[PDB]
Ligand binder design. Structure first.
Ligand SMILES: CN1CCN(S(=O)(=O)c2ccc(-c3cnc(N)c(C(=O)Nc4cnccc4CN4CCCC4)c3)cc2)CC1
Ligand SMILES: CN1CCN(S(=O)(=O)c2ccc(-c3cnc(N)c(C(=O)Nc4cnccc4CN4CCCC4)c3)cc2)CC1
Lengths: 350, 350
């Protein structure tokens, strides 16, 4: 087959470019970002994804700057990066060589939905725990993903490994600095964002993760609607009408605007009867109006819902062992070090 | 079949309730609002739509108050309204008995898209002109629809009549008064809305109409994306980067965040080669960053693109005559009475 050779800089470590050869290049994604390709490394035979985006030279690429700083088992690793041409003549493309993860939470959730089945609760715990670990990690550097949604959550169906992807909307949130409210995808946007808040925190990713949990439990999005108004109506139908205080906590420019006085709906009636109570309690705690009232990713990891993952007898339905779940770093635990008493179970490999 | 009898108040004219009997009640829509039913009037045999919404009781329904004031050939008529119940006790339901229009621009656009065809240009002129007439009308009372999109544009395929529907998001915009920016559906939202502006005018409906025109010409949305950021990237790719003046016109809290410096793309390269130049010129003039730079609905009606509609020999493909197009009222022309020199052609003056 056609072999492409490039002089790529490694993602982590010293800036020491290497000749990287790859083959079997197929397009696997096309979006607002640019193009995502799948390719096989000639050396290892290992599969990779290459994200190709047009570079301005006007500034450094924000995604690359973020990607270069990260190393987590639940985040798609930046292996290399290089520059090229490809669609535009006289223009530069930045190419991010990333880990390849075969499936998306989006496609898997769709399979079950179509077959009128729900994703087994063991997978809901595995996928959600791993998402919270990735969130604890990025948040520990002050980095907010800002686009948490099923399409950005990659899975290995055989290993049960989830890896967060898309660092295109990612930004380091500094207190007092204003940020664009128009980030985040429909169904997954926190109420502060819908209200156009520019003072939001990393707790927007927690709201999004909570929407993803509720969707895997329901078999459909919890807060649908093609407009902010429709989305808010669906939120109010579950959470009840936000208080004047709760409105202030999100955006204080929307306090004088009248809302439909809906009763605070019991979260147990939202989900099917068989739904575990700890799953319901987790949603309740993530999907909160007051951004500060939401659990943190590290606290979410330590929630009762994930206890089965900490059981020494836990196994994957295919017989295999669970992937890495307890290899926490000092950085990863930094937000609340005592949580490691819950997080690292006695049996955890050492 | 099951016959339902109600004492309904007529939508327009004096408050003189009447016994309205209807049968063959089927659900035709389910959304954030409530339910839309189709029903047959026992009297005439005439088909109607009944919109059932849960009433707040604390205050009058804004959609009902808006509907009661309107009478236009390009707007779904409120025939009657009555109160009832459905879920279950204490809960009052407002029922709007409306004209039934058999198709949606959404479904029709979808048929052509699926068949790799485009809606014939004669229909693009007929449907778009009629939308602008409905917009000229509501705007003349200071009323902004705020949710212009293909799903809210109803059609009679035999008569080529378009009728605007959904007055759920409609509001009378008063200068100096702030309005929610979270109205309007993805793909159809004006840049001021994406930027969280609360000071927007009725020209948001013009942007939406312009998105609908470009979509009927392209065979797909002009500015897709599941996030405001993705939508804005698509807008910038066509319109070029907005100036700091243009950013100020939309939202002056976003004049500080800098954007990807993309050249002002020629609108001719956006559409297929066959696309009439006046259609391209119309999108160009509707899809403008500066809200004040956009054509008004009445000016849009008077645009070169619609000249074939003013031809005395114009006929529908089935042989029939074009629906009413020139019966302008003083109210309808109020924004710019001299435009009637272009709008009312000589053959309509006889
Ligand atoms: C042969 N098949 C395998 C299965 N798919 S799939 O649609 O399930 C799919 C598509 C892409 C990936 C993928 C694998 N590894 C990655 N590192 C990325 C990735 O980084 N994607 C990405 C980058 N930037 C922004 C967004 C994304 C999200 N993806 C874009 C394509 C779909 C998800 C994406 C995985 C499965 C298509 C091709
Ligand atoms: C047998 N088929 C006929 C064609 N359809 S359809 O989906 O094309 C359809 C659905 C509804 C209408 C319809 C006909 N007349 C109306 N007056 C309204 C209406 O008022 N709809 C409405 C009310 N409030 C908010 C939004 C809407 C928008 N519609 C609701 C369904 C989608 C369009 C809706 C027309 C065609 C379904 C049943």
């Amino acid at each position: 087959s056609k072999v492409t050779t490039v002089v790529a800089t490694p993602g982590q470590g010293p800036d020491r470019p290497q000749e990287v050869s790859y083959t079997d290049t197929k397009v696997i994604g096309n979006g607002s970002f640019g193009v995502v390709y799948q390719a096989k490394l000639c050396d290892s035979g290992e599969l990779v994804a290459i994200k190709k985006v047009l570079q301005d030279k006007r500034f450094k690429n924000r995604e690359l700057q973020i990607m270069r700083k990260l190393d987590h088992c639940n985040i798609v690793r930046l292996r290399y990066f290089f520059y090229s041409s490809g669609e535009k003549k006289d223009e530069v493309y930045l190419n991010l060589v990333l880990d390849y993860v075969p499936e998306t939470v989006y496609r898997v959730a769709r399979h079950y939905s179509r077959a009128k089945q729900t994703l087994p609760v063991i997978y809901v715990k595995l996928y959600m725990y791993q998402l919270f670990r990735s969130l604890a990690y990025i948040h520990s550097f002050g980095i907010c993903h800002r686009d948490i949604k099923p399409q950005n959550l990659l899975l290995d169906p055989d290993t049960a490994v989830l890896k967060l992807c898309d660092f295109g909307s990612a930004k380091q949130l500094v207190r007092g600095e204003p940020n664009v409210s128009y980030i985040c995808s429909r169904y997954y946007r926190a109420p502060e964002l819908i209200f156009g808040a520019t003072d939001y925190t990393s707790s927007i990713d927690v709201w999004s993760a909570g929407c993803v949990l509720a969707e895997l439990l329901l078999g459909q999005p919890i807060f649908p609607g093609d407009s902010g108004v429709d989305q808010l109506v669906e939120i109010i139908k579950v959470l009840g009408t936000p208080t004047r205080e709760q409105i202030r906590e999100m955006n204080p420019n929307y306090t004088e605007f009248k809302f439909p006085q809906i009763k605070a709906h019991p979260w147990t009636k939202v989900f099917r009867p068989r739904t575990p109570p700890e799953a319901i309690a987790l949603c309740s705690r993530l999907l909160e109006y007051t951004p500060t009232a939401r659990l943190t990713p590290l606290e979410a990891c330590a929630h009762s819902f994930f206890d089965e993952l900490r059981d020494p007898n836990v196994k994957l339905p295919n017989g295999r062992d669970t992937p890495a779940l307890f290899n926490f770093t000092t950085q990863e635990l930094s937000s609340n070090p005592p949580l490691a008493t819950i997080l690292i179970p006695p049996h955890a490999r050492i």
